[PDB]
Swiss-Prot record, chain A:
Tissue specificity field: Expressed in osteoblasts, but not in osteoclasts.
SS bond partners: none
Phosphotyrosine modifications at: 3
Deletion phenotype: IRS1 deletion mice show impaired intrauterine growth, resistance to insulin and insulin-like growth factor-I/IGF1, and abnormal glucose tolerance.
PTM statement from Swiss-Prot or TrEMBL: Serine phosphorylation of IRS1 is a mechanism for insulin resistance. Phosphorylation of Tyr-3 is required for GRB2-binding. Phosphorylated by ALK. Phosphorylated on tyrosine residues in response to insulin. Ubiquitinated by the Cul7-RING(FBXW8) complex in a mTOR-dependent manner, leading to its degradation: the Cul7-RING(FBXW8) complex recognizes and binds IRS1 previously phosphorylated by S6 kinase (RPS6KB1 or RPS6KB2). Ubiquitinated by TRAF4 through 'Lys-29' linkage; this ubiquitination regulates the interaction of IRS1 with IGFR and IRS1 tyrosine phosphorylation upon IGF1 stimulation.
Region GRB2-binding, residue ranges: 3-5
Domain of life: Eukaryota
Subunit structure: Interacts (via phosphorylated YXXM motifs) with PIK3R1. Interacts with ROCK1. Interacts with GRB2. Interacts with SOCS7. Interacts (via IRS-type PTB domain) with IGF1R and INSR (via the tyrosine-phosphorylated NPXY motif). Interacts with UBTF and PIK3CA. Interacts (via PH domain) with PHIP. Interacts with FER. Interacts with ALK. Interacts with EIF2AK2/PKR. Interacts with GKAP1. Interacts with DGKZ in the absence of insulin; insulin stimulation decreases this interaction. Found in a ternary complex with DGKZ and PIP5K1A in the absence of insulin stimulation.
Subcellular localization, as worded in the UniProt entry: Cytoplasm; Nucleus
Function field: Signaling adapter protein that participates in the signal transduction from two prominent receptor tyrosine kinases, insulin receptor/INSR and insulin-like growth factor I receptor/IGF1R. Plays therefore an important role in development, growth, glucose homeostasis as well as lipid metabolism. Upon phosphorylation by the insulin receptor, functions as a signaling scaffold that propagates insulin action through binding to SH2 domain-containing proteins including the p85 regulatory subunit of PI3K, NCK1, NCK2, GRB2 or SHP2.
Gene name per UniProt: Irs1
Protein name: Insulin receptor substrate 1
Curated annotation (Swiss-Prot), chain B:
Function, as annotated: Acts downstream of various receptor and cytoplasmic protein tyrosine kinases to participate in the signal transduction from the cell surface to the nucleus. Positively regulates MAPK signal transduction pathway. Dephosphorylates GAB1, ARHGAP35 and EGFR. Dephosphorylates ROCK2 at 'Tyr-722' resulting in stimulation of its RhoA binding activity. Dephosphorylates CDC73. Dephosphorylates SOX9 on tyrosine residues, leading to inactivate SOX9 and promote ossification. Dephosphorylates tyrosine-phosphorylated NEDD9/CAS-L.
Record-given protein name: Tyrosine-protein phosphatase non-receptor type 11
Record remark on domains: The SH2 domains repress phosphatase activity. Binding of these domains to phosphotyrosine-containing proteins relieves this auto-inhibition, possibly by inducing a conformational change in the enzyme.
Region forming the signal peptide: none
Family of this protein: Belongs to the protein-tyrosine phosphatase family. Non-receptor class 2 subfamily.
Coiled coil: none
Subunit annotation: Interacts with CD84 and with phosphorylated SIT1 and MZPL1. Interacts with FCRL4, FCRL6 and ANKHD1. Interacts with GAREM1 (tyrosine phosphorylated); the interaction increases MAPK/ERK activity and does not affect the GRB2/SOS complex formation. Interacts with PTPNS1 and BCAR3. Interacts with phosphorylated LIME1. Interacts with SHB and INPP5D/SHIP1. Interacts with KIR2DL1; the interaction is enhanced by ARRB2. Interacts with GAB2. Interacts with TERT; the interaction retains TERT in the nucleus. Interacts with PECAM1 and FER.
């Protein structure tokens, strides 16, 4: 259920 | 393409990627947080992960990243270009199998 934020 | 689900809530994207999906299965759905936006839900490694897509009017990105004109080529670009998605100092995220 994790709203993940990407690292680019 | 059919990886798009306009009818589904965050909870149903969990129930489908769990019962019917395999790791690498993903889908795009309307956002419950931001109306008129969409979130990708990816089943990665046992669990479901949601990623917010940003639509600014002038383009789609994943809140940073390369900018795309439509939702559909955004998913296309990330299915084809393996490896550009790293969770913040966590694993990679692969958008492999379109769901249903």
């Amino acid at each position: 259920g994790e709203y993940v934020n990407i690292e680019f | 393409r059919r990886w798009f689900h306009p009818n589904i809530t965050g909870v149903e994207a969990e129930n489908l990627l769990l019962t019917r999906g395999v790791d690498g299965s993903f889908l795009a759905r309307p956002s419950k947080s931001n109306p008129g936006d969409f979130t990708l839900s990816v089943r990665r490694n046992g669990a479901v992960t949601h990623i917010k897509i940003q639509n600014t009017g002038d383009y789609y990105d994943l809140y940073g990243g390369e900018k795309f004109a439509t939702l559909a080529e955004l998913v296309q670009y990330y299915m084809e270009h393996h490896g550009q998605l790293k969770e913040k100092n966590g694993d990679v995220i692969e958008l492999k199998y379109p769901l249903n």
